[PDB]
């Protein structure tokens, strides 16, 4: 391969990345509610979710390295207050030009 090759077209935009939300603010920070798939509401701004490098409108996949693509606000809101400290929370998010 000279000039090129193989394998290198569809490339991958978006990755899983991994982000916690530190509690110690009137709650988590961040509001979080819709049914399986879950998604992100909106982030609060100046706080431990955002700070942290969480950004909205994006879909939960596995927290606390649990599978919750198949849960609900209820079901995963019982899982996050498990912790009143911190929780981890993983999405996927693409690194682009994705305004909104």
Same mark, same amino acid.
């Given at each position: 391969? &000279? $000039?090129? $090759? !193989?394998?290198? /077209?569809?490339?991958? *935009?978006?990755? #899983? ?5 530190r509690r /110690? #603010? ?9 049914? $399986?798939? +879950?998604?992100?509401?909106? +982030?609060? &701004? /100046? /706080? ?12 939960? =996949?596995? =927290? *606390?390295?649990?599978?919750?693509? @198949?849960? #609900?606000? +209820?079901? =995963?809101? @019982?899982?996050?207050? &498990?912790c009143p400290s911190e929780i981890?929370? =993983?999405?996927?998010? +693409? !690194?682009?030009? $994705? &305004?909104?």
């Open positions: 391969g &000279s $000039s090129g $090759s !193989s394998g290198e /077209g569809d490339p991958e *935009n978006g990755e #899983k990345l991994q982000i916690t939300i /110690g #603010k009137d709650g988590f920070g961040f509001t979080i509610c819709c049914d $399986s798939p +879950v998604r992100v509401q909106a +982030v609060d &701004s /100046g /706080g431990p979710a955002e700070r942290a490098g969480l950004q909205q409108l994006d879909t939960v =996949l596995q =927290l *606390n390295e649990r599978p919750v693509e @198949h849960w #609900k606000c +209820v079901e =995963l809101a @019982h899982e996050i207050r &498990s981890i929370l =993983l999405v996927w998010r +693409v !690194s682009g030009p $994705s &305004s909104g």
